[model samples]
Target: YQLMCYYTSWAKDRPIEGSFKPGNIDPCLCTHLIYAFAGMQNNEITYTHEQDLRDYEALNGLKDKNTELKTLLAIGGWKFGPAPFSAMVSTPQNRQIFIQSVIRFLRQYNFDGLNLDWQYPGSRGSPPKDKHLFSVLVKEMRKAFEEESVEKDIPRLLLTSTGAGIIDVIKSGYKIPELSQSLDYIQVMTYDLHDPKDGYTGENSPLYKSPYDIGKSADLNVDSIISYWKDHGAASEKLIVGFPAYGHTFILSDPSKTGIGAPTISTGPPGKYTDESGLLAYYEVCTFLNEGATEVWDAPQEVPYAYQGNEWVGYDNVRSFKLKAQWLKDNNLGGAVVWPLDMDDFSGSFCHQRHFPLTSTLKGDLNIHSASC
Candidate 1:
């Protein structure tokens, strides 16, 4: 199975306890190490800032340790949005310009593939035609990759992409039948289905649907999201499931009401490391557990949440990850992926467990047995 682990580009700038660079990675753990947010300038992909050049080398350098490990450069994260993507895919000529640059860029950076991170095709400052244009873009890229490999005699650059978990976003931005074959893998972002913005407390990534979830809220859970993709023409093996390395934090309006749908006054306090309001790094989440919050496990959701005074967080713990792993095995999907590798307890100083406490558990548990020889 494919284990695609993404490393956020800015993680190196984080505090000591949270900072993670290429050297910190265990090359053997994941089949692919993707460096996220390779931005765009002038409608063409640019290797991140000069500040990230060294990190780029260090990231792909891991292939020296594990021959099978593939390094991928992920393009256009949330901040980049769909502006550049919308412009580039407008015409065949423009798409070619973008496509050629990608092949050159990936090889130049020693990356094995390109992880298209376009936030959405037809949403977020984009036109409805974008959904189809988005399909046109990848098919052209794939053809070029094949042409380049045959003429120049090099390995074909792999093509993969991140997908929105929201059904509306998926419907508006994707041509599922086309996308199913154009890209090698689709890492469906199954987290953030519920968050502080909802004005209520809910699991960050619930594995199953809960009774409190009403109406269309039913589509937000992990199982349903993945199923939608599979049912919409994408093969189960080509859909990579995504996991969060962080948690959603919230401040409950009432200390006594900390259940899944409890009302919340605001996002919880920023983490000492992540420093992002409404979110906490897994390491920071672990510290909260040690501080003795009243932890509650939503058996139906197969996820956990903790509350301390008015501070509350919906997060996945070691046991929750184990359950997720079993679900992965049961589904026999493509593979598992974790977002922001740096957000996990990489140093082990806070979690008291070994490094990457949450992520490593997936690697360990999923090792139960391979079916074929």
Candidate 2:
């Protein structure tokens, strides 16, 4: 099983002592640490910043301590948008140039793979061609990777990509059958199922559909999203369920209207650490709980949410993670992914349970054993 953990490079910039660097990572905790995100400047693999190179060395350095660990360099993210991806594969020449650059870049940095994470294809101002071209893009990359491995007498680089769990993205962005054949694995982004922009408060990553859900909302849960992808020819063993170590927050329109479907006036205030409105890191959530917030467990959704005053936040904790982890095993999927390792109370200073309480719960429940698990 691949316990793929994401290491957001930007997490090094958080305020005070909360900022996370590669040095803070637990080498044995995750089987693969995905360093997000490598950049695609001029359709070539490039570091996001100067320090990214140093971090590349530092992040990969973890392998010296644990030989079983794998490292991948990811490109594109939510903010990177779809324009660059469209441009990168607009023509055959452009696609070959990008493919060559990616090969050289992965070999140069000693990365085990390249993770292409464009926010979406057909949508986000991208064209219909984006859909067809993406399949071509990955198939070509796979061919190159195999050819290069034979030429250099080395291991082939893994070609992995993330998928939007939403059905619109599944239909509009991905060519699953072709993609499944070419790529090594697909990281299903199961979080962000609900946010403030949805016009109501909802669980961030509910495992199942709530009874209160109606129409399209019924298909918005983890169960429906995975089922849709699987039904559409995505391979079961290549699928990895992504878990969020953060909560989606919303400002309640009325204190008394506190439930899953409650009206939200705005995004919740920025967290003390993540410093982002509408989101709170697991550590920040723990602090809120310690400081007094009423938490509610959604049995139907198989998750939990908390509220105090007009602030509402939906997130997963150790208990919910155990259930979700068990569900993942029952499905017999490829593995599990924690969206970000840094935000999961890495130090155990705030949560008081242990380091990486949320992550640890998944690793433990999924039966990923190492020297120190």
| Predicted structure with the largest lDDT when compared to the true one | 2
lDDT of 1 by residue, 1-373 (tens): 6777999878888887678887779877777888987877766788668977888889888888787788888998778888889998998888887888888888888999999999889999889999989999988898899899999898888899999998999999989989888899999999987755768898889999888888767788889999889888887888889889888999889998889999998888888778888998888888998999888889989999989999999988888888988897789888888887888888888888888888788778766222221
lDDT of each: 0.86, 0.89
What is the alpha-carbon lDDT for the whole of candidate 1?
A: 0.86
Q: Write the per-residue lDDT of candidate 2 for residues 1-373, one digit (tens) a residue.
A: 7799999988989985678898678888898899999888778888989899889899888888887788999999999999999999889988999999999888888789988898888889989889999999999999999999999999889999999988987899899999999999999999988855768998889999989889888887888988988999999999999899998999899999889989999889999789888999989999989999998999999999999999999999998888888888888888889988888998899899988998888777777876633
Where does the lowest 10-residue lDDT sum fall in candidate 2?
364-373
Write down the TM-score for model 1.
0.96
What are the per-model numbers of colliding residue pairs? Answer: 0, 0
**By summed lDDT, which 10 consecutive residues of candidate 1 come out lowest?**
364-373
> Which residue pairs collide, candidate 1?
none
- Which segments of candidate 1 are over 4 A away from where they belong? 368-373
